[PDB]
């Protein structure tokens, strides 16, 4: 399989 | 913010 | 977060 | 009275 | 606060 | 009499 | 006989 | 992917 | 003379 | 609060 | 949550 | 003066 | 196949 | 913040 | 010939 | 997985 993501979440 | 990411998966 | 605030109360 | 305040906050 | 008073009271 | 008397009292 | 067979699967 | 076979099975 | 006075200021 | 004052002044 | 909490200032 | 305030914020 | 979960999550 | 996930992946 | 055979494969 | 088979091949 292939996957990416990419997740920058701030508070 | 500032963000910048790029990604290309391939399978 | 982000957060400005100034107060200069006087009596 | 005198007073002067700046204030740039950013997120 | 502010104050200013004179009183010469005479007899 | 005589008196003569200023006052500026600023806040 | 002859066979002949090829097979590359992937999950 | 990729894949490159060749097969000439003669009887 | 004859004077009598009461002052309870509070903040 | 709570004040109380009596004053009987005479000439 | 839970939050109980009581205040009577008097002045 | 007379204050009373109570804050509980939770994330 | 056989699963059983149970899960109350209380903020 | 409260959360409660259960994942039983499979193949 | 004579074959007798069972399969009962669960997932 | 799940998988069963059965092959009893004569000549």
Do not use: D, R
Request: glycine share 0%; proline share 9%; no cysteine.
């Amino acid at each position: 399989y292939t996957i990416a993501a990419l997740l920058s979440p701030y508070s």
